Amino acid sequence: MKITVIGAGNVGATTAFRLAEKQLARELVLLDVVEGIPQGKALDMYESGPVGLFDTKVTGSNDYADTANSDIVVITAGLLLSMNAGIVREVTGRIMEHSKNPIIVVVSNPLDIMTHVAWQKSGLPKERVIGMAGVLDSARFRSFIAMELGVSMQDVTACVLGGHGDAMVPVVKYTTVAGIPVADLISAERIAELVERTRTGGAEIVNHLKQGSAFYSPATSVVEMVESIVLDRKRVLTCAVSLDGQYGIDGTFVGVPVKLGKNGVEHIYEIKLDQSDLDLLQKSAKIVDENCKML
Amino acid sequence: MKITVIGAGNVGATTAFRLAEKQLARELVLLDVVEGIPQGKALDMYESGPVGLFDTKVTGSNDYADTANSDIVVITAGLPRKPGMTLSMNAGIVREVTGRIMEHSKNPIIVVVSNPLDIMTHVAWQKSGLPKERVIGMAGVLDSARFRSFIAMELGVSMQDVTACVLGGHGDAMVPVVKYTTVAGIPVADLISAERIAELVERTRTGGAEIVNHLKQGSAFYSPATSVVEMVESIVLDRKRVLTCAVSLDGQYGIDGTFVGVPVKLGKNGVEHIYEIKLDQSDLDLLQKSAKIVDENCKML
Amino acid sequence: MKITVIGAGNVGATTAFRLAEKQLARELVLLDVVEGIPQGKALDMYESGPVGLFDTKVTGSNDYADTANSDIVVITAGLLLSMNAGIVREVTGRIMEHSKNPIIVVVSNPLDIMTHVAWQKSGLPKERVIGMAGVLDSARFRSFIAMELGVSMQDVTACVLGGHGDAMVPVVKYTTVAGIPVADLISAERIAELVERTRTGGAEIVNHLKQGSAFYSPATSVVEMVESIVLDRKRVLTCAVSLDGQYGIDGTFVGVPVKLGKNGVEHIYEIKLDQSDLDLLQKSAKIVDENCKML
Amino acid sequence: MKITVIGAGNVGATTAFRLAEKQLARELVLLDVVEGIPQGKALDMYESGPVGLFDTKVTGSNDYADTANSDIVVITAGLPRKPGMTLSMNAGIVREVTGRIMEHSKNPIIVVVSNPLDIMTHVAWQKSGLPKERVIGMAGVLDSARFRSFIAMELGVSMQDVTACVLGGHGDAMVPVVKYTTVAGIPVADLISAERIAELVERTRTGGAEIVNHLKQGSAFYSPATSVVEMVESIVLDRKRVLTCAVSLDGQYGIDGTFVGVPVKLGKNGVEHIYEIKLDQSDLDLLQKSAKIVDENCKML
Ligand SMILES: NC(=O)c1ccc[n+]([C@@H]2O[C@H](COP(=O)([O-])OP(=O)(O)OC[C@H]3O[C@@H](n4cnc5c(N)ncnc54)[C@H](O)[C@@H]3O)[C@@H](O)[C@H]2O)c1
Ligand SMILES: NC(=O)c1ccc[n+]([C@@H]2O[C@H](COP(=O)([O-])OP(=O)(O)OC[C@H]3O[C@@H](n4cnc5c(N)ncnc54)[C@H](O)[C@@H]3O)[C@@H](O)[C@H]2O)c1
Ligand SMILES: NC(=O)c1ccc[n+]([C@@H]2O[C@H](COP(=O)([O-])OP(=O)(O)OC[C@H]3O[C@@H](n4cnc5c(N)ncnc54)[C@H](O)[C@@H]3O)[C@@H](O)[C@H]2O)c1
Ligand SMILES: NC(=O)c1ccc[n+]([C@@H]2O[C@H](COP(=O)([O-])OP(=O)(O)OC[C@H]3O[C@@H](n4cnc5c(N)ncnc54)[C@H](O)[C@@H]3O)[C@@H](O)[C@H]2O)c1
């Protein structure tokens, strides 16, 4: 098992470190454009092995040749829509030169589009390319409900399809505390607020740090997904994937419940959404598929 | 944090070992009536510390003075069962044990595991003289675990993403709420036929017996030990987790005094909140019938 | 990764469970001769998955056909020397019918001989077959030193070659607390005692339980070894392996420091022992190689 | 168990996150001088709890009253360094911080991380007014970690099996004892040429600078955070671990009063024992020279 995390900033570095200590890979390559930074961070991570008790071979590089034969590739490269799309497209192209069949997990925003960009570029089947967002939105939502109710975050479940912001589709219907519907524990008034805080959760962090975005939750989320693939856990998580009919959408990437296994997306769940939500999901997908045209 | 586990059998020991490795306690005492067994299992466990990387001081004893001033006590003392069985004996055991520990620990949190659970928990609570918040029994978590593992098998999904609501107690007293059973929030009724769900609900119902018939000379202990610890960890780490445990109600679900398996918030103060969820008439009905049967025996004792 | 643990008694069951929760395998097969027991224990373990958060597919069986294509096989079968040798030889033969190239880790006593029996039977190269004992003896010794000094067991190191009992070769020279020689922390008087307690450590447990042997420490030890192989950790642990010259011994299995990787024994370390110890190791190996003749 | 971490930077935050996930504390406070950063990093961390499965209450603050009654305090406040550097400033920072926390916590265990370590630890201890057992600094563990990772690379063995003894402090004050450096007990001198060992001893010596030159805008934090936590975990779980930490000697190694990096037994009472190992004249010599230099500055302050 050889994993490559493109991008050595907070997100990709926090991600690689977690992936290193969890030992989900024998070889882990942290690659970035800036000289030095990737090499120093990967070394700092490696020298952590004797105390954290992991033996993952973590190396930082600038040469894609060091990412040859990677099984999984995490793309966190980013710095507009036309710019990043180019960054993502180029990166995908460079890795596809040294790896003929990996699973690509995208973490760049706009997620859905960036994921599409990468996919259509790699030439890999829609099963081998996915994006991360739902796990993260779900996580923020779950933590808000926890703070509200004074319960453990492990017992809170939150079904969140779609993308970030106005494109987010939180299914309050499939959201619970130990199976007990949130609707029976929290007023709709407050639930509406917690749903709002979730839509603008990334920004809430940014408004705090001023510089850059959030990276702990985002990194932890990406790993949960990678872990499922590596350990063939068959976990069901809301990821961005290319639909092929479900939800009355075809071709365009959307955030829907999926089963992640050694072969990536092993199943797309078409849950029962009510018109409202099902509409927002289709509009949002139209807007997205729109942009994927210019590109 | 000192944790005492009465009973060095399959459940008690497996539980103790798990507690040791997880390092939830600084001092872990494994006491039993039969001499030798707790000491040997305790040593075998401790000698595991260098490879499992934990330093919990696990001590096996036959003397209750060693349990003095405990924060949490796990009671697993009692005879299991053979293929063909289904309280007179354990009632006395559990009571003797409880009164025995209370001499050395005046304010612990007791977690009862001994069967018949609901009733054995009442016996301990009754004998301890501790407020009902400090005494609870383990059952729901295990029942839920089995239901989840089955659904996972059926759908081929991770057991982590399956949620199962199960209240009441074991056997016909088991009230599994398919309504609050899901796969990543998605209702199981939307993924598995009702006909097949009832069977899985059946397997769950007779889950313990399925293990007993296989083992033939005893019952299950791995899942039971894992479940007990999930509960203790919540208390130790004050995680405020919501788990189905056997506790003494005070009106919720239309039941008073008797111990029932309901969703509760578990913290360092024990039962910090009892959740009275929404159940249809048929479920409240069973839950209350069961509750009366249990309430029957308890008084008969 | 598919692992099979032969023997469903305390040792093999405690082992399989630990292997299940650590997720070192996708498929884990617990096989035994007695009907029912393996099926019940493996099920009890599996139903533990939702609370212990692992998804290892653990199944109990009586049909070796269910152990087909196993990568690693842990043999804990046992119930005299001629008896067990037959048990081990038969088991090895049955698995070799459904798996052409696994790594075999033996846990039956007498270890060295039982390991040889299995090896010469499987027909596999000496790299694919090893036995467990040193890790366990080291572990008991390490814990005694810890109890004596009032320090953590993680920081105690103990080099132990040879086998159990009189065949045990504890190198007090290579035994330390954070690198600090035990000889500088504990009197030779007491060290002699702690070394004695180690030689008879298995029996100390048995004298307590009356029925059967110890199984927690023995199981934890076996896993450490298996973990190293599965995760290609390249750990250095004293295991029983077929030497090929080192220590002035050839062919006969001995407990020596080795590097365990995805290919099993990747290196045998010939440390510098003083005559005394080096002698006890050769005598012990002669006695062993003696018995491996009758068989 | 309440743990305060002063400094929400790369080391402070990475450390806090690790502490949160490991659940070693119920309440974890991340305080900094710059407003916003600790709050944001704290939230980002907490929002990680549902996927990382931990419930530690991580709160980011700018107010010291939030650190009140802390059991353990980790000081990482201070300016790092850029390629080309090697105390005047941090001395004031560390002292201000220490006197600030002591107003709200009257008996914590302070773990200093701010450079120059040996000296910054003296500054805190001096200002806290706490017995020398309650104040220690982190350095040895990190130095040892780097040496181990190098040997592992060189021999192709697990880093878990490599043991490295390193005393003193960073730089020329670093006293790595090749004599007590091994691979599964086997002396490294028996596995690696002396010539190559000295180089690895060199890399270790300038390890931090190697990271600094790569990063260019800051220093290392992953290994440093991992090392600090290894120490805190020992205290929290009273594991009595033996780690090389910077502490105030009282004669051992022929050094009095000054802080030196020596092997110590770490428990809930802090430094529970200082180990005076056997060193040859040359090593005792450096250790003492370094110690005097450090003892020099401290008084100059
Ligand atoms: N999926 C989500 O919901 C989510 C959450 C958080 C952040 N993000 C996004 O993830 C990205 C990384 O966030 P961060 O906080 O780690 O940022 P960052 O700026 O610290 O790190 C990104 C790193 O990528 C490098 N980079 C840029 N272009 C590159 C290229 N072509 N090849 C290789 N490296 C390149 C930069 O130089 C930089 O060091 C951002 O685009 C951000 O918007 C997404
Ligand atoms: N709540 C559940 O879901 C659940 C699951 C499994 C087992 N159980 C119950 O837990 C109990 C233990 O199961 P087990 O498999 O560990 O059994 P076991 O027979 O292996 O062990 C029970 C131990 O209790 C000891 N014991 C008996 N009387 C005692 C007394 N007065 N004081 C101290 N120790 C005493 C025995 O000597 C024995 O070692 C049984 O009552 C069983 O039915 C409940
Ligand atoms: N390596 C060590 O240092 C070490 C430590 C402890 C125990 N051991 C040895 O390990 C073995 C297991 O110990 P245990 O405590 O688990 O014992 P146990 O008797 O509880 O379990 C062994 C199981 O193997 C089964 N068995 C016997 N022959 C078999 C065959 N041909 N095929 C399949 N299953 C068979 C039995 O029926 C039994 O259920 C013993 O031989 C013991 O002496 C070695
Ligand atoms: N002991 C070791 O082995 C070791 C390893 C790495 C770093 N360090 C040292 O640790 C310190 C922090 O390193 P870093 O990488 O986290 O740096 P950093 O610059 O990322 O973070 C330091 C944080 O301290 C805060 N700060 C400054 N003055 C403060 C005051 N008076 N009160 C409260 N907060 C204040 C800053 O605002 C900043 O967020 C440095 O002094 C560095 O040299 C020691």
CSV table of N, CA, C and O in Angstrom, one decimal, chain A residues 13-14 17-18 21 36-37 39-40 43-48 50-51 53-55 139-140 142-144 147 152-154 197 204-205 208-209 214-218 220 224, chain D residues 13-14 17-18 21 36-37 39-41 43-48 50-55 145-146 148-150 153 158-160 210-211 214 216 220-224 226 230:
chain,number,residue,atom,x,y,z
A,13,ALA,N,-0.8,18.1,5.1
A,13,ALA,CA,0.2,17.7,6.1
A,13,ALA,C,-0.4,17.1,7.3
A,13,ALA,O,0.1,16.1,7.9
A,14,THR,N,-1.5,17.7,7.7
A,14,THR,CA,-2.3,17.1,8.9
A,14,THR,C,-2.8,15.7,8.5
A,14,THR,O,-2.8,14.8,9.3
A,17,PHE,N,0.2,13.1,8.2
A,17,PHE,CA,0.6,12.7,9.5
A,17,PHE,C,-0.3,11.6,10.1
A,17,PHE,O,0.1,10.6,10.6
A,18,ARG,N,-1.6,11.9,10.0
A,18,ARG,CA,-2.6,11.0,10.6
A,18,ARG,C,-2.6,9.7,9.9
A,18,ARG,O,-2.7,8.6,10.5
A,21,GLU,N,0.6,7.8,11.2
A,21,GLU,CA,0.5,7.2,12.5
A,21,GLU,C,-0.6,6.0,12.5
A,21,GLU,O,-0.5,5.1,13.3
A,36,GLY,N,11.9,22.3,-0.3
A,36,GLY,CA,12.1,22.3,1.2
A,36,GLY,C,10.9,21.9,2.1
A,36,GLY,O,11.0,20.9,2.8
A,37,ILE,N,9.8,22.7,2.0
A,37,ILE,CA,8.7,22.4,2.9
A,37,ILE,C,8.2,21.0,3.0
A,37,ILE,O,8.1,20.4,4.1
A,39,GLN,N,9.8,18.2,2.3
A,39,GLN,CA,10.9,17.4,2.8
A,39,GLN,C,11.0,17.6,4.3
A,39,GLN,O,11.3,16.6,5.1
A,40,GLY,N,10.8,18.8,4.8
A,40,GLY,CA,10.9,19.0,6.3
A,40,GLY,C,9.8,18.5,7.1
A,40,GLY,O,10.0,17.9,8.1
A,43,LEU,N,9.8,14.7,7.2
A,43,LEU,CA,10.9,14.3,8.1
A,43,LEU,C,10.5,14.4,9.5
A,43,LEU,O,10.7,13.6,10.4
A,44,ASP,N,9.8,15.5,9.8
A,44,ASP,CA,9.3,15.8,11.1
A,44,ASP,C,8.3,14.7,11.5
A,44,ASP,O,8.3,14.2,12.6
A,45,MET,N,7.5,14.3,10.5
A,45,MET,CA,6.5,13.2,10.7
A,45,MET,C,7.2,11.9,11.0
A,45,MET,O,6.9,11.2,11.9
A,46,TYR,N,8.2,11.6,10.2
A,46,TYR,CA,9.0,10.3,10.3
A,46,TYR,C,9.6,10.2,11.6
A,46,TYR,O,9.6,9.2,12.3
A,47,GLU,N,10.3,11.3,12.1
A,47,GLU,CA,11.0,11.3,13.4
A,47,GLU,C,10.0,11.2,14.5
A,47,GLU,O,10.4,11.2,15.7
A,48,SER,N,8.8,11.1,14.1
A,48,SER,CA,7.7,10.9,15.2
A,48,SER,C,7.5,9.5,15.4
A,48,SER,O,6.9,9.0,16.4
A,50,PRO,N,9.2,6.7,16.2
A,50,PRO,CA,9.7,6.1,17.5
A,50,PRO,C,8.9,6.4,18.7
A,50,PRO,O,8.8,5.6,19.6
A,51,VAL,N,8.2,7.5,18.7
A,51,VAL,CA,7.4,7.8,19.9
A,51,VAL,C,5.9,7.5,19.7
A,51,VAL,O,5.2,7.2,20.6
A,53,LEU,N,5.0,5.2,17.7
A,53,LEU,CA,5.1,3.8,17.4
A,53,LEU,C,4.5,3.3,16.1
A,53,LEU,O,3.8,2.3,16.0
A,54,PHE,N,4.9,4.0,15.0
A,54,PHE,CA,4.4,3.6,13.6
A,54,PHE,C,5.7,3.6,12.8
A,54,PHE,O,6.7,4.2,13.2
A,55,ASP,N,5.7,2.8,11.7
A,55,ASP,CA,6.9,2.7,10.9
A,55,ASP,C,6.7,3.0,9.5
A,55,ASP,O,7.4,2.6,8.6
A,139,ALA,N,-19.8,16.0,10.1
A,139,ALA,CA,-19.0,16.1,11.4
A,139,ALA,C,-19.3,17.4,12.1
A,139,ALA,O,-19.6,17.4,13.3
A,140,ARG,N,-19.3,18.6,11.4
A,140,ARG,CA,-19.6,19.9,12.1
A,140,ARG,C,-21.0,19.8,12.7
A,140,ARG,O,-21.2,20.2,13.8
A,142,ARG,N,-22.9,17.2,13.5
A,142,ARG,CA,-22.9,16.3,14.6
A,142,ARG,C,-22.4,17.0,15.9
A,142,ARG,O,-23.0,16.8,16.9
A,143,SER,N,-21.3,17.7,15.7
A,143,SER,CA,-20.7,18.3,16.9
A,143,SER,C,-21.6,19.4,17.5
A,143,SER,O,-21.6,19.7,18.7
A,144,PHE,N,-22.4,20.1,16.6
A,144,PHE,CA,-23.2,21.2,17.1
A,144,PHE,C,-24.4,20.6,17.9
A,144,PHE,O,-24.7,21.0,19.0
A,147,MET,N,-23.1,19.5,21.3
A,147,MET,CA,-22.9,20.6,22.2
A,147,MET,C,-24.3,21.1,22.8
A,147,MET,O,-24.4,21.4,24.0
A,152,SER,N,-22.4,12.6,23.7
A,152,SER,CA,-21.2,12.3,22.9
A,152,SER,C,-21.4,12.4,21.4
A,152,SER,O,-22.4,12.1,20.9
A,153,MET,N,-20.3,12.9,20.7
A,153,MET,CA,-20.4,13.1,19.3
A,153,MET,C,-20.4,11.7,18.6
A,153,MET,O,-20.8,11.6,17.4
A,154,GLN,N,-20.0,10.7,19.3
A,154,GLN,CA,-20.0,9.4,18.6
A,154,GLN,C,-21.4,8.9,18.4
A,154,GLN,O,-21.6,8.1,17.4
A,197,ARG,N,-25.4,27.2,10.9
A,197,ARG,CA,-24.0,27.2,11.4
A,197,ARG,C,-23.2,26.2,10.6
A,197,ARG,O,-22.0,26.4,10.3
A,204,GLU,N,-16.7,29.9,9.6
A,204,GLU,CA,-16.6,30.3,11.0
A,204,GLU,C,-15.2,30.1,11.5
A,204,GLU,O,-14.7,30.8,12.4
A,205,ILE,N,-14.5,29.1,10.9
A,205,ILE,CA,-13.1,28.8,11.3
A,205,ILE,C,-12.2,29.9,10.7
A,205,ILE,O,-11.4,30.5,11.5
A,208,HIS,N,-12.1,33.1,12.4
A,208,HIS,CA,-11.3,33.0,13.6
A,208,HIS,C,-9.8,33.1,13.4
A,208,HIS,O,-9.1,33.9,14.0
A,209,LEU,N,-9.3,32.3,12.4
A,209,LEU,CA,-7.9,32.3,12.1
A,209,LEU,C,-7.4,33.4,11.2
A,209,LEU,O,-6.2,33.6,11.1
A,214,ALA,N,-9.7,25.8,7.8
A,214,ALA,CA,-9.7,24.8,8.8
A,214,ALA,C,-8.9,23.6,8.3
A,214,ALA,O,-8.9,23.4,7.0
A,215,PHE,N,-8.3,22.8,9.1
A,215,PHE,CA,-7.6,21.7,8.6
A,215,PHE,C,-7.6,20.4,9.4
A,215,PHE,O,-7.4,19.3,8.9
A,216,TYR,N,-7.9,20.5,10.7
A,216,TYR,CA,-8.0,19.3,11.6
A,216,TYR,C,-9.2,18.4,11.2
A,216,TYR,O,-9.1,17.3,10.8
A,217,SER,N,-10.4,19.0,11.3
A,217,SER,CA,-11.7,18.3,10.9
A,217,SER,C,-11.6,17.9,9.4
A,217,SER,O,-11.9,16.7,9.1
A,218,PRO,N,-11.2,18.8,8.5
A,218,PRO,CA,-11.0,18.4,7.1
A,218,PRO,C,-10.1,17.2,6.9
A,218,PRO,O,-10.3,16.3,6.0
A,220,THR,N,-9.1,14.9,9.3
A,220,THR,CA,-9.7,13.7,9.9
A,220,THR,C,-10.8,13.1,9.0
A,220,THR,O,-10.9,11.8,8.9
A,224,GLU,N,-10.9,9.2,7.3
A,224,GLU,CA,-12.0,8.2,7.5
A,224,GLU,C,-12.3,7.6,6.2
A,224,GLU,O,-12.5,6.4,6.1
D,13,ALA,N,-0.8,23.8,19.2
D,13,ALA,CA,-2.0,23.3,18.6
D,13,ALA,C,-1.8,21.8,18.3
D,13,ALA,O,-2.7,21.0,18.7
D,14,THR,N,-0.8,21.4,17.6
D,14,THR,CA,-0.6,20.0,17.3
D,14,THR,C,-0.6,19.2,18.5
D,14,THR,O,-1.1,18.0,18.6
D,17,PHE,N,-4.3,19.1,19.9
D,17,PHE,CA,-5.1,18.1,19.1
D,17,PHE,C,-4.8,16.7,19.6
D,17,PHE,O,-5.8,15.9,19.8
D,18,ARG,N,-3.6,16.4,19.7
D,18,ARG,CA,-3.1,15.0,20.1
D,18,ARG,C,-3.7,14.7,21.5
D,18,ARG,O,-4.2,13.6,21.7
D,21,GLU,N,-7.6,14.0,21.1
D,21,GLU,CA,-7.9,12.7,20.6
D,21,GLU,C,-7.6,11.6,21.5
D,21,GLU,O,-8.4,10.6,21.7
D,36,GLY,N,-8.4,35.0,18.5
D,36,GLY,CA,-9.0,34.3,17.4
D,36,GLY,C,-8.4,33.0,17.1
D,36,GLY,O,-9.1,32.0,16.9
D,37,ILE,N,-7.0,32.9,17.0
D,37,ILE,CA,-6.3,31.7,16.7
D,37,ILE,C,-6.6,30.5,17.6
D,37,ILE,O,-7.0,29.5,17.1
D,39,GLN,N,-9.2,30.1,19.6
D,39,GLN,CA,-10.7,29.8,19.5
D,39,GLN,C,-10.9,29.0,18.2
D,39,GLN,O,-11.6,28.0,18.2
D,40,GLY,N,-10.4,29.5,17.1
D,40,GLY,CA,-10.6,28.8,15.8
D,40,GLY,C,-9.9,27.4,15.7
D,40,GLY,O,-10.6,26.5,15.2
D,41,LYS,N,-8.7,27.3,16.2
D,41,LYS,CA,-8.1,26.0,16.2
D,41,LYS,C,-8.8,25.0,17.2
D,41,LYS,O,-8.9,23.8,16.9
D,43,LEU,N,-12.0,25.0,18.0
D,43,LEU,CA,-13.2,24.6,17.3
D,43,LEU,C,-12.9,23.6,16.3
D,43,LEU,O,-13.6,22.5,16.2
D,44,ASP,N,-12.0,23.9,15.4
D,44,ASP,CA,-11.6,23.0,14.3
D,44,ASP,C,-11.3,21.6,14.9
D,44,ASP,O,-11.6,20.6,14.3
D,45,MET,N,-10.6,21.6,16.1
D,45,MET,CA,-10.3,20.3,16.7
D,45,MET,C,-11.5,19.6,17.2
D,45,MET,O,-11.7,18.4,16.9
D,46,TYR,N,-12.3,20.3,18.0
D,46,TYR,CA,-13.6,19.7,18.6
D,46,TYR,C,-14.4,19.2,17.4
D,46,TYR,O,-15.0,18.1,17.6
D,47,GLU,N,-14.6,19.9,16.3
D,47,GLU,CA,-15.4,19.5,15.2
D,47,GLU,C,-14.8,18.2,14.6
D,47,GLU,O,-15.3,17.6,13.7
D,48,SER,N,-13.7,17.8,15.2
D,48,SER,CA,-13.0,16.5,14.7
D,48,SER,C,-13.5,15.4,15.6
D,48,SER,O,-13.4,14.2,15.1
D,50,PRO,N,-16.3,13.9,16.3
D,50,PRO,CA,-17.2,12.9,15.8
D,50,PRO,C,-16.6,11.8,14.9
D,50,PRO,O,-17.1,10.7,14.7
D,51,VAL,N,-15.6,12.2,14.2
D,51,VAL,CA,-14.9,11.3,13.3
D,51,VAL,C,-13.7,10.6,13.9
D,51,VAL,O,-13.4,9.5,13.6
D,52,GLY,N,-13.1,11.3,14.9
D,52,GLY,CA,-11.9,10.8,15.6
D,52,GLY,C,-12.4,10.1,16.8
D,52,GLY,O,-11.6,9.5,17.5
D,53,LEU,N,-13.7,10.1,17.1
D,53,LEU,CA,-14.3,9.5,18.2
D,53,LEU,C,-13.7,9.8,19.6
D,53,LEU,O,-13.2,9.0,20.3
D,54,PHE,N,-13.7,11.1,20.0
D,54,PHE,CA,-13.3,11.6,21.3
D,54,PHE,C,-14.2,12.7,21.6
D,54,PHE,O,-14.8,13.3,20.8
D,55,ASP,N,-14.4,13.0,22.9
D,55,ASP,CA,-15.3,14.0,23.4
D,55,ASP,C,-14.6,15.0,24.3
D,55,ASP,O,-15.3,15.8,25.0
D,145,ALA,N,14.3,10.5,19.9
D,145,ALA,CA,13.4,10.1,18.8
D,145,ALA,C,14.2,10.2,17.4
D,145,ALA,O,14.2,9.2,16.7
D,146,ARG,N,14.8,11.3,17.2
D,146,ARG,CA,15.5,11.5,15.9
D,146,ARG,C,16.7,10.6,15.8
D,146,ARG,O,16.9,10.0,14.7
D,148,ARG,N,16.9,7.6,17.1
D,148,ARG,CA,16.3,6.3,16.8
D,148,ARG,C,15.8,6.2,15.3
D,148,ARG,O,16.1,5.1,14.7
D,149,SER,N,15.1,7.2,14.8
D,149,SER,CA,14.7,7.1,13.4
D,149,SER,C,15.8,7.0,12.4
D,149,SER,O,15.6,6.4,11.4
D,150,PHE,N,16.9,7.6,12.8
D,150,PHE,CA,18.1,7.5,11.9
D,150,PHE,C,18.7,6.1,11.9
D,150,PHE,O,18.9,5.4,10.8
D,153,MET,N,16.6,3.8,10.0
D,153,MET,CA,16.8,4.0,8.5
D,153,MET,C,18.0,3.2,8.1
D,153,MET,O,18.0,2.5,7.2
D,158,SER,N,12.5,-1.6,12.8
D,158,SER,CA,11.4,-0.8,13.4
D,158,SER,C,11.9,0.2,14.4
D,158,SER,O,12.8,-0.2,15.1
D,159,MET,N,11.4,1.4,14.4
D,159,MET,CA,11.8,2.4,15.3
D,159,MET,C,11.4,2.1,16.7
D,159,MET,O,12.0,2.7,17.7
D,160,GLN,N,10.5,1.2,16.9
D,160,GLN,CA,10.1,0.8,18.2
D,160,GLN,C,11.1,0.0,18.9
D,160,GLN,O,11.2,0.1,20.2
D,210,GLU,N,18.1,21.1,10.7
D,210,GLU,CA,17.8,20.4,9.4
D,210,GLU,C,16.3,20.6,9.0
D,210,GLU,O,16.0,20.8,7.8
D,211,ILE,N,15.4,20.7,10.0
D,211,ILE,CA,14.0,20.9,9.8
D,211,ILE,C,13.8,22.4,9.5
D,211,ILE,O,13.1,22.7,8.5
D,214,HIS,N,14.6,23.4,6.0
D,214,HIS,CA,13.7,22.9,5.0
D,214,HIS,C,12.4,23.8,5.0
D,214,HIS,O,12.0,24.3,4.0
D,216,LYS,N,12.1,26.8,6.5
D,216,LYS,CA,12.5,28.1,6.2
D,216,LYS,C,11.8,29.2,7.0
D,216,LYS,O,12.4,30.2,7.3
D,220,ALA,N,10.3,22.5,13.5
D,220,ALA,CA,9.5,21.3,13.6
D,220,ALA,C,8.5,21.3,14.7
D,220,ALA,O,8.6,22.1,15.7
D,221,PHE,N,7.4,20.6,14.6
D,221,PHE,CA,6.4,20.5,15.6
D,221,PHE,C,5.7,19.2,15.8
D,221,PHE,O,5.3,18.8,16.9
D,222,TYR,N,5.7,18.3,14.7
D,222,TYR,CA,5.1,17.0,14.9
D,222,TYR,C,5.8,16.2,15.9
D,222,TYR,O,5.2,15.8,16.9
D,223,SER,N,7.1,15.9,15.7
D,223,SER,CA,7.9,15.1,16.7
D,223,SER,C,7.9,15.8,18.0
D,223,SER,O,7.7,15.2,19.1
D,224,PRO,N,8.1,17.1,18.0
D,224,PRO,CA,8.1,17.8,19.3
D,224,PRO,C,6.8,17.7,20.1
D,224,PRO,O,6.8,17.5,21.3
D,226,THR,N,4.6,15.2,19.7
D,226,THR,CA,4.4,13.8,20.0
D,226,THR,C,5.2,13.5,21.3
D,226,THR,O,4.7,12.8,22.2
D,230,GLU,N,4.0,12.3,25.0
D,230,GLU,CA,4.4,11.0,25.6
D,230,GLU,C,4.7,11.3,27.1
D,230,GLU,O,4.4,10.5,28.0
